[PDB]
Write a protein that binds this ligand. Structure first.
Ligand SMILES: [Ca+2]
Ligand SMILES: [Ca+2]
Ligand SMILES: [Ca+2]
Ligand SMILES: [Fe+3]
Ligand SMILES: [Fe+3]
Ligand SMILES: [Fe+3]
Ligand SMILES: [Fe+3]
Lengths: 166, 511, 388, 388, 511
């Protein structure tokens, strides 16, 4: 079974997810998953064709568990890990505002997503963060966007140039 | 005094700017480097009720023509086969552009702080909903009354099988809504609509009428009447941010990136649909392009905004340099991969080859011969056991997918651009076809992680992908896509299975 | 020239002949139904459904999507064009919603256009008939110009609360419904101003400027909590569903309905004002139309979701409690307006009974659908505290 | 078949080629304006005039006619199809009339259709919104059902008074206006029944049967003089112009306008009834629309005719006097209805003020046009003497 | 229970019958021999608002198609010359039928006593108003966008010049409103609409389509959708008086007179317009006529009314015998008097002559030879000094006008009926072409005093009558009417004046 929308990989993860019966274990698995399989900093590209769908299934379980474990105030203001969402948001924005350059900035933003994307952090705080973090990231990145030659930009990004043609 | 009196839209609009009020958190919810001026005004003085009336009038004329005279004239049938197929792509692909423009303008409405500028964007939010339904209606009408309903009837799901769809989502979906609201406005309004869609829509009606299609002109001409408002919105976006220090720093960079994004896909795709998807020609794409991009937009339109700091895109020259053969280079790929579409394609006939050679000297010696050979190999016949993709494999002509634009390219065969950049980064290979898209990825890697068809289909047999993604006709065996537009000898799923074509990721060859 | 220079393939003999020869003997597929693969909500697939469902290019990782793979271009940082992360609510399929009124663009602008043209006719007949003569001067210059006028800002803010949703909605059917809910709100705000502009034309000295109504809204007491609630719903809510749900199934269902129906619609007639009710009739028609769509999305689709019903009701109960408090405060401050009325206009019993009608309707049409345990008398008692 | 068997000359290659071959190089006349010979009432000839003026084949012996000779077939006895002998009024041209609103069939049904569809929506909003809860039960079960419903027979009667005019009108522009004036009247009658039918659906014991309202109309006392005035304007008048003039510029302008605008449109609101005013808004819009037409025909065209100005004004003043009596008698009998109103509904002061509004509007819009000397004080006094 | 509730047309119509009440003078104001039952019901349960809505929907489609697609296709121009001319007559003549139908049903509405029957007629009153404006619009549109606006733009006055108009007024103007309300109902509904109008309207769209005219089908097919309500009105009219003893005494005679009146004009006129006013043919008129009058009307329709005492008109057999050559006989007269029209006529071309002979054996030896004789003599060339009317005088073939029907006839030349009855009464001569019309005049002389063209134009020189009645085109010199449909060599007023043609009353030859 190797399909696009249905396959053994997806089936396997649905089973593993079905075994996440407590919030803390489920939330930790979701965060680990994001570190292992999302963004260009992912630890591995092995689940490239299915991670988006599997992540969504993992999110579903963490959400249902959180709504059952958290009282109303905490569901609105705490992260699945028990952190005060406002504190995390403000602290991350502070780091972003102190970022010395676009390289530091991109790591702060990308890392924030991997660690706090809903249902970890309440949507209201998470998107407020997207609003503020993205603004600084773009400001830093779009300043003198074309000054660095491609030859040097490739080195800054740290890619391995495999083949060039022209 | 009891004289019959009333109140119109302008009379109410006079006080609309005052509707917004101040409070600490009254600010946009989206990330942006720019600041839209609080006093920005709008060109048209509309209110909800009047907007609805003016669109309602247009609808009545449009649907009246479609349901009465055009149906009585059998207008859905008396269209050239090639064009009936072209409209499956043209109408459904534009539909997604219209659709995402709804969300894009919802985002701009949120960005604007002046009640009048919000209102201008609002009218476009509604117009884009209308346009989505209009494009949907074209496919709906051709499916209901046309010569070949397949594709017209399920493009929303069958478009996911092919590679051409991926690029459309970049320029007409994600490019419209993902990023700085201003960057999106540039892709959508300042570049997308002003440079391409506005002229495109009208051109489509010309090509349509020439090939017997009076359905598309009826709808698209009606769509076009709403564009003035959208152009004003785009121009107004620039005015609203012109007096902010950020504008001098970032505007031209976002504009240049938007221009390249839009041009990268439309330069080759539009010309391809027009020239190859038609029987009767209206005008060579080359001259249509130069007038649109260079003269009208890159000259007249772009010039008017010079006073606001706007400048001609720095990649404009490269764009023109790569433009000439672009669409010709792409049709070779689209036809080679014909089994992955939701429409039927045809090889250029003798009469068409002459036209191509006449308007593009050197066409025959390159593309002409190739098509003649594929014809000889029996690419149109189900019993040949041949698909042009095999020819690319036999002649070591790998086809790559640009990581940023999603536009397919074969650098070893193209007469246009032939550059290829391959990088490895954190365990993944990435292939780029130009220096502008490469910069985009190096600077913003996390923005471009789209998996290409080869990555997703790697190791999969062709017939299985088509079957899984429902690329079959109602009989459950004949393919929707075809290598010819005749009514007999249509390829079946079994004809494809027998080819035993198994996809592989071309980048894996690199060490 | 009489004939023109452009030759058309449908009518040009030579070209049509070429086209006709290339045609097949019959359609290459007998399935002439666009959207045949969409699961119909009703007996047969509707034009509304065919033209709308699946227009949004979502991949399977966003519940109900038919596409595959990541977006081609995302926001700086990595945020997806559309994603599950933009709302707390979860579902088996974001494409399940159906506007019970089946409104796609054409039918929508058609009805509003009819309402616009009839409004113009009504106003020309109202002015020519001199019906303004019997309207109480104080009600007109004070309650219509200042208080009804200030309410335009309430409706305007609710309109604006929909901007993020127009951008983030996870399906075509929901995006279209949301856009229409918002568009009707700006329309009402504009009809309130329309009435003020009309009065300025038929009543010498009546100032159509929004300065007075706006000053009432921004600095008055009667609408203080209403404005605070609206500012919150609009700009402090980043979840597109919390916004639409809280606006339509909490705030506007309680505060909005009370103001429009139990105050202005109920008292205007008592002062010889048949003009304001003409417009409120539209607002109430719009309110009831949107209610059907709101109930379908939040109760039928989300609150009754086969897999996330319990989860979604928990979240909506949470949101109801979150916004019920600010909503009660809004109604409480509004109670202050009753003391401004000429003696004998209405009394505590009438006011209380009218509060109960709104609360009972809200419990029946919204609260009970998600098992929210609302206490009718406690809600009313909290509001009455605002009566001066 | 996919292509069908029938070949059409516009799209068939062979046939179209033959047609194109026979066409001239350019139109055989540059005057492409149909109705170009018609004298425009406004700046430029309108679609309304082009499509209507001169459709009636009158010969020159009927003021304005462009044809010649007698009719081809006449009545037994010799009566002409149409003739000067069917009306006392005379003119230099029967085609001078122009509906100020320029209504030909299309605009007319478009407007009424919009009203029908909005009415439907409004009723669905009203019922869903539970607005019936605040309506006074006595005003509903007694004054809306019995007295408002009885008035439907008054409108129906005025409607029928147009039957002969539909047949005898001496011009197209006049026939169209007349037909629309009458159709709007039956519409009003059917709208009164529509409301009673609606109430019947949302009010458990309300009976929609016309039994009660009919008996009130046929045997009651409040509408005694009203009905007698109607039976006369309809079945005792054989002059199509006297019928339209007296009905629209005398009776309905005084009696009709008082009942609709000064009684129901003025008091219904006081009983928490915004339903009835919704329909009365239509009736008043229609009344004011028709007035402009009535005025243009009898005053601008006939009463001011370059040759029969004096003659016509005399005939109309004669008509005004002839029917002013039955009208005042109608208004008197109606006064007896106020005694049925719950104590404190209105006072003789308000009523007197409402009667002067009607009489003053009538004098300003009709009476003064033909120089008919009417005494507001005496008329009001005569009617006011009906209060019990 | 706050469920969205409303009320529909049927729910109100339920109590419509009770709207009427009893009182001394509650009775029809028009003379009649019958009594319509005051409890008669109507078939369609409509109220004013629903009626408006259903018609409004039809209008939007129609005008939408006309203003949009059809105009974009130049549908007003790409019509055969002969048909462009034929529509000047068809649409305007039909217009008066629609117009008088308004007054007719207005008279019927006054006649009915049952509220529902009145409401039925009322619906038609409004429908006929819509039809008047629809036929007007067709002429308006062809004047605006057609190849020859003259006639289309002023038929309301230029139609008064020719003899064909007189007979049109008899069947579609006076026949509809002058007489016993019931007689008129029979001319209008029972015979006119059920036997001719209904079948004709559709037939017209067929001939129109065959000759390139898509404008007429768009309008006429819409008009046709309203005819079911009028058919019902006609049927209910009979049921309405079936119980009155007077019915058995008068019904069949008013119907027979009604049948003869209508067929007398349409049998020759419609077949003439169809076969001689077109290039492409649909079906031979003899075939069409037989189906309409005998199969459909005389059989099926009249059959269903049998139970109400209705019988086939006694003059039916006579109608069929006089029919065969009727339309061919008339065109000879219409063409001979071409200068009195407001439209351009053409002589049959070679293909048409072959078609006529094939469908009407013997056509060539009579009509064909005559047209060829006239053409060789130069009837199409303005410098010939020849108008076919001169040929009739030369060969002693007087043309008379039936005093009753106004239909022109030439007994000495006719291949069809050739009877002629001439009488003098109180100093006035009268000419009749059949026994039914003669009886009508004898029994009702005061109902038929219509002056004919020879009587009015007696002693007048042709060009003077034309000039006086504005039978000229914009340049004030060229005639609207023409003996050919080509663009060059159009006849002028001077070309006519030079003929020195002076009208004479043909009946005075018996003095
Ligand atoms: Ca390697
Ligand atoms: Ca306070
Ligand atoms: Ca009390
Ligand atoms: Fe658009
Ligand atoms: Fe646009
Ligand atoms: Fe008709
Ligand atoms: Fe009819």
């Amino acid at each position: 079974k190797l399909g696009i929308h249905s396959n053994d990989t997806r089936d396997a993860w649905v089973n593993k997810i079905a075994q996440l019966n407590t919030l803390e274990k489920a939330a930790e698995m979701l965060k680990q998953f994001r570190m292992d399989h999302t963004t260009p900093f992912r630890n591995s590209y092995e689940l490239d064709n299915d991670y988006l769908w599997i992540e969504a299934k993992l999110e579903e379980k963490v959400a249902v568990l959180k709504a059952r474990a958290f009282n109303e105030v905490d569901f609105r203001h705490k992260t699945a890990f028990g952190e005060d969402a406002k504190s995390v948001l403000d602290g991350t924005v502070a780091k972003m505002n102190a970022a010395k350059d676009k390289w530091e900035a991109e790591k702060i933003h990308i890392g924030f997503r991997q660690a706090y994307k809903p249902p970890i952090m309440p949507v209201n705080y998470f998107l407020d963060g997207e609003r503020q973090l993205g603004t600084r990231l773009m400001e830093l990145r779009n300043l003198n966007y074309y000054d660095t030659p491609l030859e040097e930009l490739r080195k800054q990004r740290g890619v391995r140039v495999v083949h060039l043609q022209s | 005094n009891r004289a019959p009196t009333s109140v119109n839209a302008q009379e109410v609009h006079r006080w609309l700017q005052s509707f917004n009020w101040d409070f600490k958190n009254n600010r946009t919810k989206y990330a942006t480097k720019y600041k839209m001026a609080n006093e920005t005004k709008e060109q048209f003085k509309l209110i909800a009720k009047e907007y609805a009336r003016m669109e309602a009038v247009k609808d009545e004329r449009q649907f009246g023509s479609l349901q009465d005279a055009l149906t009585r004239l059998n207008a859905g049938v008396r269209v050239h086969p090639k064009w009936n197929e072209t409209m499956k792509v043209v109408s459904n692909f534009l539909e997604v552009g219209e659709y995402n423009a709804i969300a894009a303008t919802g985002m701009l409405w949120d960005s604007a702080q002046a009640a009048e500028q919000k209102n201008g964007y609002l009218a476009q939010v509604l117009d884009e909903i209308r346009h989505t339904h209009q494009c949907a209606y074209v496919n709906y009408y051709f499916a209901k009354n046309g010569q070949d309903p397949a594709g017209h009837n399920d493009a929303r799901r069958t478009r996911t099988i092919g590679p051409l769809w991926k690029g459309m989502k970049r320029v007409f979906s994600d490019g419209f809504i993902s990023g700085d609201a201003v960057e999106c406005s540039l892709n959508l309004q300042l570049v997308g609509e002003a440079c391409f869609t506005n002229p495109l829509i009208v051109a489509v009606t010309e090509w349509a009428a020439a090939n017997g299609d009076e359905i598309t002109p009826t709808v698209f001409l009606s769509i076009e009447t709403d564009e003035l408002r959208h152009m004003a919105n785009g121009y107004q976006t620039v005015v609203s941010i012109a007096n902010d220090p950020a504008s001098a720093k970032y505007l031209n960079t976002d504009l240049n990136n938007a221009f390249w994004t839009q041009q990268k896909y439309f330069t080759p795709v539009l010309g391809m649909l027009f020239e190859y998807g038609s029987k009767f020609k209206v005008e060579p794409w080359v001259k249509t392009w130069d007038r649109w991009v260079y003269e009208d937009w890159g000259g007249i339109w772009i010039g008017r905004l010079g006073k606001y700091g706007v400048e001609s895109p720095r990649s404009l020259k490269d764009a023109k340099q790569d433009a000439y053969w672009a669409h010709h280079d792409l049709y070779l790929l689209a036809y080679a991969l014909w089994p992955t579409g939701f429409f039927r394609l045809a090889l250029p006939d003798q009469e068409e080859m002459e036209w191509f050679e006449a308007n593009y000297p050197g066409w025959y010696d390159h593309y002409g011969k190739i098509y003649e050979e594929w014809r000889a190999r029996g690419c149109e016949d189900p019993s040949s056991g041949f698909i042009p993709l095999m020819w690319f494999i036999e002649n070591n002509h790998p086809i790559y997918i640009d990581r940023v634009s999603q536009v397919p390219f074969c650098p070893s065969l193209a007469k246009g651009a032939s550059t290829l950049r391959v990088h490895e980064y954190n365990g993944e290979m990435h292939t780029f076809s130009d220096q502008w898209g490469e910069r985009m990825w190096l600077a913003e890697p996390e923005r471009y992680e789209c998996q290409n068809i080869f990555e997703q289909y790697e190791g999969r047999e062709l017939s299985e992908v088509i079957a899984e993604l429902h690329g079959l006709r109602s009989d459950g065996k004949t393919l929707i896509a075809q290598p010819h537009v005749r009514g007999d000898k249509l390829w079946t799923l079994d004809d494809i299975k027998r080819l035993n074509c198994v996809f592989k990721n071309p980048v894996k060859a690199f060490n | 020239s009489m004939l023109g220079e452009r030759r058309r393939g449908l009518t040009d003999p030579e070209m049509a002949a070429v086209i006709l020869k290339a045609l097949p003997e019959a359609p290459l597929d007998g399935n002439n139904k666009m959207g045949y693969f969409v699961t119909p909500r009703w007996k047969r697939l509707t034009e509304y459904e065919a033209l709308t469902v699946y227009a949004q290019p979502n991949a399977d990782w966003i519940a109900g999507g038919l596409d595959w793979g990541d977006w081609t271009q995302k926001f700086h940082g990595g945020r997806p064009s559309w994603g599950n992360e933009t709302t707390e609510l979860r579902t088996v399929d974001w494409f399940k919603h159906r506007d019970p009124l089946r409104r796609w663009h054409a039918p929508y602008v058609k009805d509003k256009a009819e309402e616009w043209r009839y409004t113009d006719r009504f106003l020309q007949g109202y002015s020519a008939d001199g019906q303004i003569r019997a309207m109480n001067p104080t009600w007109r210059d004070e309650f219509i110009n200042r208080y009804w006028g200030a309410f335009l800002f309430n409706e305007y803010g609710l309109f604006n609360a929909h901007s993020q949703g127009a951008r983030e909605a996870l399906s075509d059917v929901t995006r279209v419904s949301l856009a229409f809910w918002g568009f009707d709100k700006i329309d009402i705000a504009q009809m309130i101003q329309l009435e003020r502009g009309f009065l300025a034309k038929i009543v010498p000295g009546f100032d159509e400027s929004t300065a007075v109504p706006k000053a009432e809204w921004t600095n008055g007491e009667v609408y203080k909590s209403a404005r605070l609630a609206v500012e919150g719903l609009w700009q402090e809510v980043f979840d597109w569903n919390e916004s639409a749900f809280s606006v339509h199934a909490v705030y506007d269902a309680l505060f909005g309905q009370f103001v429009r129906r139990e105050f202005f619609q109920r008292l205007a007639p008592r002062f010889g004002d048949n003009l304001t009710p003409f417009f409120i009739n539209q607002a109430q028609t719009y309110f009831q139309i949107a209610k059907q769509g709101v109930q379908d999305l939040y109760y039928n689709c989300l609150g009754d979701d086969p897999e996330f019903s319990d989860y979604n009701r928990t979240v909506m109960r949470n949101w109801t409690g979150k916004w019920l408090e600010p909503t009660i405060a809004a109604l409480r401050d509004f109670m202050g307006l009753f003391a401004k009325l000429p003696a004998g206009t209405t009394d505590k019993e009438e006011i209380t009974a009218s509060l109960y009608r709104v609360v009972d309707d809200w419990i029946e049409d919204y609260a009970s659908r998600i098992d929210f345990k609302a206490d009718r008398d406690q809600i009313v008692k909290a509001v009455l505290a605002g009566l001066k």
